[PDB]
Amino acid sequence: AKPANKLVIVTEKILLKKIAKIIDESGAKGYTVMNTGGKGSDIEANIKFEILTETREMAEEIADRVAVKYFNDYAGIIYICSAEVLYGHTFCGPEGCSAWS
Amino acid sequence: AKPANKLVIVTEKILLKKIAKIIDESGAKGYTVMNTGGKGIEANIKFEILTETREMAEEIADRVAVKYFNDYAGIIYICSAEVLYGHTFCGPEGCSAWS
Amino acid sequence: AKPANKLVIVTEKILLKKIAKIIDESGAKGYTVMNTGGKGSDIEANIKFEILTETREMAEEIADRVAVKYFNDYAGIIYICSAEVLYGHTFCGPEGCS
Numbered sequence A: 001a002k003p004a005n006k007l008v009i010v011t012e013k014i015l016l017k018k019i020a021k022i023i024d025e026s027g028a029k030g031y032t033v034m035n036t037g038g039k040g041s042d043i044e045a046n047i048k049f050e051i052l053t054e055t056r057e058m059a060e061e062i063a064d065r066v067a068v069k070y071f072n073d074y075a076g077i078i079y080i081c082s083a084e085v086l087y088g089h090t091f092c093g094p095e096g097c098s099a100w101s
Numbered sequence B: 001a002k003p004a005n006k007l008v009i010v011t012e013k014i015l016l017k018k019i020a021k022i023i024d025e026s027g028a029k030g031y032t033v034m035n036t037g038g039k040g041i042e043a044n045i046k047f048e049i050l051t052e053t054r055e056m057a058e059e060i061a062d063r064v065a066v067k068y069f070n071d072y073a074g075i076i077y078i079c080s081a082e083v084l085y086g087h088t089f090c091g092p093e094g095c096s097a098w099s
Numbered sequence C: 001a002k003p004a005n006k007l008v009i010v011t012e013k014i015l016l017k018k019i020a021k022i023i024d025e026s027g028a029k030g031y032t033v034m035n036t037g038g039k040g041s042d043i044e045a046n047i048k049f050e051i052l053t054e055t056r057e058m059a060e061e062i063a064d065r066v067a068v069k070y071f072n073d074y075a076g077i078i079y080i081c082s083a084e085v086l087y088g089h090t091f092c093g094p095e096g097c098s
């Protein structure tokens, strides 16, 4: 298994493309996005991104860039969880996530 | 970053308003909810609720499970998280960036 | 609360039924699945499974069987998180989750 940080961004859908580009620019290998409802008839339609990064610093770069640019004007939350990646050709590279010495 | 508990509730879609009302009464500052499938495929719902304290998460969990989960299908679990940005979650005080 | 392992599988939607068969065959008590979008405009419709297991080996058996059968030919990521289950009759049994 490979150590990973899982960054979650829940925010307004209008920010989809701008947050996707930030993610791409960060060096993150991929991301998952989903339509969600949220509250912070009072529910609103939101999107949630999940991004697995190899380092906490990469996760924080994305979080910091999204927030500084958009979180004054747009609703949002960003949080981070620990995870271990078991399989993922781009995340772990060709030798896989359980390579030996 | 501010320590958080991420409470997740996966249950029958018909309980959406009922469960949102409990979350709204709890003191939690928000919630995300999404349409999902499952078995435990039926179309159901998943809530995620970030709370500042484990105690708030567990009060939500207890209230929801006792009121509904002997009569409706449901699972409730909790994960650790850290909040990096969140105006209402961390307050005007911010997410204590240097801790 | 009962310690649990949260296995996540994000992969191509066409594999929905093939993966669900594997989850069931592993002994897992259930799963959640949802429609997602992934990059890895260049977002393609895909699926995410979340599976809570009592043991780490059960989660890894699901992981190993899905990846070996499919990940040479289909895109995917599988990762794992700690969790605790608070309520869940099938997960915890009739005594509850403590």
Ligand SMILES: Nc1ncnc2c1ncn2[C@@H]1O[C@@H]2COP(=O)(O)O[C@H]2[C@H]1O
Binding pocket: A010, A011, A012, A037, A038, A039, A040, A044, A045, A046, A075, A076, A077, B028, B029, B030, B031, B032, B033, B048, B049, B050, B051, B086, B089
């Ligand atoms: N405490 C929380 N727990 C879970 N989700 C949250 C929390 N606070 C805010 N959110 C999500 O972040 C979203 C921000 O935009 P909305 O307020 O439309 O809806 C909010 C919720 O979906």
Ligand SMILES: Nc1ncnc2c1ncn2[C@@H]1O[C@@H]2COP(=O)(O)O[C@H]2[C@H]1O
Binding pocket: B010, B011, B012, B037, B038, B039, B040, B042, B044, B073, B074, B075, C028, C029, C030, C031, C032, C033, C050, C051, C052, C053, C088, C091
């Ligand atoms: N062990 C598990 N892992 C992930 N999801 C679960 C598990 N057990 C139950 N569920 C989810 O919780 C839901 C409760 O309603 P269902 O029985 O319709 O469908 C269930 C699944 O989506």
Ligand SMILES: Nc1ncnc2c1ncn2[C@@H]1O[C@@H]2COP(=O)(O)O[C@H]2[C@H]1O
Binding pocket: A028, A029, A030, A031, A032, A033, A050, A051, A052, A053, A088, A090, A091, C010, C011, C012, C037, C038, C039, C040, C044, C045, C046, C075, C076, C077
């Ligand atoms: N680093 C990552 N973080 C979050 N999700 C990812 C990551 N890499 C791949 N994925 C997801 O795994 C999916 C595999 O199928 P796709 O390429 O269609 O889209 C991919 C993303 O949804």
